[PDB]
Amino acid sequence: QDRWLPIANVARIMKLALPENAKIAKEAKECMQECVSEFISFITSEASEKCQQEKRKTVNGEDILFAMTSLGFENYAEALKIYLSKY
Amino acid sequence: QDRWLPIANVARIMKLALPENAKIAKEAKECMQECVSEFISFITSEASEKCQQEKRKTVNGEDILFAMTSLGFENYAEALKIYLSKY
Amino acid sequence: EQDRWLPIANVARIMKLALPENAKIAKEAKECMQECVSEFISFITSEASEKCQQEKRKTVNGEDILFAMTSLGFENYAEALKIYLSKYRE
Amino acid sequence: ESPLYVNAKQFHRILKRRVARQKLEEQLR
Amino acid sequence: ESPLYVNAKQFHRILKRRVARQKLEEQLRLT
Amino acid sequence: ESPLYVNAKQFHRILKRRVARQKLEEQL
Amino acid sequence: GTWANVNQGLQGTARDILTTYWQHVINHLESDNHDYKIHQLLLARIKKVMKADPEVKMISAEAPILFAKGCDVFITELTMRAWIHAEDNKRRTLQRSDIAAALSKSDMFDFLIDIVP
Amino acid sequence: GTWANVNQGLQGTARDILTTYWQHVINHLESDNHDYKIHQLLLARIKKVMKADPEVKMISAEAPILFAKGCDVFITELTMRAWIHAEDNKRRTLQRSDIAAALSKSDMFDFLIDIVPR
Amino acid sequence: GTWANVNQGLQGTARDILTTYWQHVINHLESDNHDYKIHQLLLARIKKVMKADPEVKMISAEAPILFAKGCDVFITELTMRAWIHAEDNKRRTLQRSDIAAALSKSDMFDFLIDIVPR
DNA sequence: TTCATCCTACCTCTGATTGGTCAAT
DNA sequence: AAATTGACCAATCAGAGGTAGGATG
Ligand SMILES: [Cl-]
Ligand SMILES: [Cl-]
């Protein structure tokens, strides 16, 4: 289970994404769960390799933003940079 | 409060009375608690008045049974009679 | 036997007092702390014990515990309890 | 909804429990 | 259905995640 | 995970407690 | 006569089942090896219900022990009577209206008309 | 170029709405008063996904917080991209095939080719 | 120096709170009217822990009294050190892993390497 | 084709159960 | 001090009701 984000939180965000009338198939929720969980694992694997090769043990915010840029999530990296500078 | 038996014990007896897959509404548990608590208070009050009228201070097993018989719980009196004589 | 551990109710009471009044403690946290503080005793006592055998003495005393505490890098514990031990004897 | 005659073995004890429950509630408050 | 070239920024990390994912399955079925 | 050098004041007493702990566990 | 209350107001298989439940209760009470130390917390609380009545003074140890057994039977038989009404509405969750419906089948339950109006 | 992914693969009304949704996200992150509040159970679950990778040793407290927010945006965008295919088929129920269809429109999602075969 | 262990591995507010805890412990041990009469069962159990070592022969009445006091300080400072990790993870329940995390911040706790594997 | 109205099957979301710690005994 | 059990909180799961999507004419 530790591979996947919990499904209830995923289903809540999807419901807010959709019009009031909309239903979501159980299959659709499970799929979205696997997708967002790979999104984390994917970016984190990139960030983690760069840390190991620069002899740092701590994966920090800049490592996640740098990895998003590398992997072609530039819109995510720039939008979230603003969020991180306030932290 | 002193008026009511604790609800966990009541809920446990109810769960054992129902099929293994049955659910019990909170309101059903709370209702059964009030019922069984009055069952005690009702029989006890009849036993307690007979004691006062016959100037006795202690209420004993045979008074509970005599009160159950007079109040129309005859099955409860006759079944528990057998139990009292073993005690 | 299993006399290797302090009783857990005393450990959990001291822990409860260390935390904000509305904190909770997991059973496994209490058990962990119980083993930690019991090795704290065994670890120090073993050092104090060896020195006693090497100086041919039979009794382990208060000075021996404090000396073992400084030896093992529990200097703050030895210095704070020094004050306490002096008062015990006067 | 509300019947005049109930169990003949219980009626008198029901009336008394109504009185005893009212007292408890007024002594509670 | 399955293409030879994918997003050039992502392709290598994809090959590595295929390996890292295989090794998670090796342990789960073992244990 | 398992370091070569630990606290210099404690190392030798740690080694000795590992021996003493196995022997206590030998009774069972 | 003495067992009229066992199946009063029940028809069909419910009748046989409540009857068989009482037979099972009676055989149990007829057994020779009773353990008369039910939890001190439950017997303490039974006694506190009895002592809420100002008229009550002293209570025999015998009395709470009779009510412990009696209250187990009462809850069991009323729950089983109430389940009938949940099964008829094709429900798996027992509701308050199932206890109310059950009470209305037998005048043994008339003492509860203010508790469950 | 760094906003290319916002509408890559979308046509007509869908382009405007996903663009507007991204303007909404950026306005939100630019605001001055952030909680940075994560539920304990979500925080422990993000760390556990990251930690499943043996190469990951220690994680900063700010990393799970970035992912909390990024995963909100990822779910919403993809759900909104998926819904288009549900509307096209005049359906009220979003299905797995709507997500599959959404993934195929942008190469940003190539990383998911083994998670959703299509 | 002597008090290095009070603060070893702690940062920010935790550092002042553990130092203030130790100043409170020292004020208490410096007070002139101690009661050395601690419960028969706790001192029976302390002696039994000491006596579990075959190398120990006879134990002074002083030794168990030093440990009763020392163990209260040990438990308190480690629980307070472990609570920091509970707060960092937005939790109000202390877990075993909060204790493990606290042991890793100071080499004073190296003696517990086999009691709490980490 | 476009309705009218069933039925069947799935999803929703309230509310019941579960898991685990405190408090009382 | 240790074990047992009720109460309670937060997190999860299940079922009772609601809506979709299909069948028929
Ligand atoms: Cl019995
Ligand atoms: Cl925020």
> Is the C-alpha dihedral spanning B37, B38, B43, B44 positive or negative?
positive
Q: Report I:49-88 residues touching F (Cβ under 8 A).
A: 52-55
> Which two tokens mark F15?
């080694």
Question: How close D8 gets to chain B, by Cα (Å)?
Answer: 9
**Cα(G34) to centroid(ligand 1), Å:** 4
DSSP reduced 3-state for I98: helix
| Residue B58 φ/ψ, nearest 5 degrees | -90, 140
D13: nearest Cα among G105, G55, G104: G55
CATH of domain C1-90: 1.10.20.10
From chain A, the residues in CB contact with H66 under 8 A are: 61, 64-65, 80, 83-84
A83: nearest Cα among H27, B16, C21: H27
Which residues pair with residue I93 across a beta bridge?
C24
Position G81: which residue type? R
Subunit partners of chain E (3 or more CB pairs within 8 A): A, H
Rounded CA separation G78/D1 (Å):
22
Question: How close B85 gets to chain G, by Cα (Å)?
Answer: 10
The distance of Cα B10 from the centroid of its chain, to the nearest Å, equals 12
Which residues pair with residue B43 across a beta bridge?
none
Rounded CA separation H15/H10 (Å):
5
> Which two tokens mark D22?
């009212």
> Is the C-alpha dihedral spanning G106, G109, G111, G116 positive or negative?
negative
DSSP reduced 3-state for C24: strand
Which method, experimentally, gave rise to this model? X-ray
Which residues pair with residue G94 across a beta bridge?
B24
| Residue D10 φ/ψ, nearest 5 degrees | -110, -25
| Domain A1-87 of CATH type 1.10.20.10 | yes
Which residues pair with residue C59 across a beta bridge?
I58
Who contacts G19 (Cβ-Cβ below 8 Å, separation ≥6)? G6, G7
Asked if residue H78 lies in contact with residue A35, where contact means CB atoms within 8 angstroms, the answer is yes
Instruction: Identify the DSSP state of E23.
Output: H
Rounded CA separation I64/I61 (Å):
6
The answer to whether I52 contacts C11, with C-beta atoms less than 8 Å apart, is: no
H or E element, residue A83: helix A74-86
Asked if residue G102 lies in contact with residue G79, where contact means CB atoms within 8 angstroms, the answer is no
The answer to whether D16 contacts B38, with C-beta atoms less than 8 Å apart, is: no
- CB-nearest to I113 from F6, F20, F24 is F6
Q: What is the resolution of this structure in A?
A: 2.3
Rounded CA separation G71/I84 (Å):
50
H helix intervals, I31-95: 40-51, 62-88
> Which two tokens mark G41?
């917390």
DSSP reduced 3-state for I8: coil
Question: What are the structural domains, with CATH classification, of chain G?
Answer: 1-117 (1.10.20.10)
| 3-state helix/strand/coil string of C35-80 | HHHHHHHHHHHHHHHHHHHHCCCCEECHHHHHHHHHHCCCHHHHHH
Asked if residue H65 lies in contact with residue A59, where contact means CB atoms within 8 angstroms, the answer is no
